[PDB]
Ligand binder design. Structure first.
Ligand SMILES: *[C@@H]1O[C@H](CO)[C@@H](O)[C@H](O)[C@H]1NC(C)=O
Lengths: 50, 50
């Protein structure tokens, strides 16, 4: 009757010296807040007319 | 009346520069909003996958 000793189920990250890698993915902060123009979009367009 | 075509072509070039600037501004706005939406969706998908 053979003994069940050679069965070693391996894990993924049991105790790898506690790496604790801080990713901190700042993907939401990568937005393009574009500045406006030099005006003449609503003031000059309404003041000039025809 | 010899100075009329000069001002005519000057105004035509000005209008061309203006419409090209408007097209470039619209294209930049399109690229900006598309990049924002794509980055948001990619971040959501990556968070769900993780
Ligand atoms: C399984 O193997 C690991 C390293 O390879 C060892 O630390 C562990 O004690 C083993 N477990 C058994 C039940 O043999």
């Amino acid at each position: 009757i053979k003994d069940f000793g050679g069965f070693n189920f391996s894990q993924i990250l049991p105790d790898p010296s506690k790496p604790s890698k801080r990713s901190f993915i700042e993907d939401l902060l990568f937005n393009k807040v574009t500045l406006a123009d030099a005006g003449f979009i609503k003031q000059y367009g309404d003041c000039l007319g025809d | 009346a010899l100075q009329i075509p000069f001002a005519m072509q000057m105004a035509y070039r000005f209008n061309g520069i203006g419409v090209t600037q408007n097209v470039l501004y619209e294209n930049q706005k399109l690229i900006a909003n598309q990049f924002n939406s794509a980055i948001g969706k990619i971040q959501d998908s990556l968070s769900s996958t993780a």
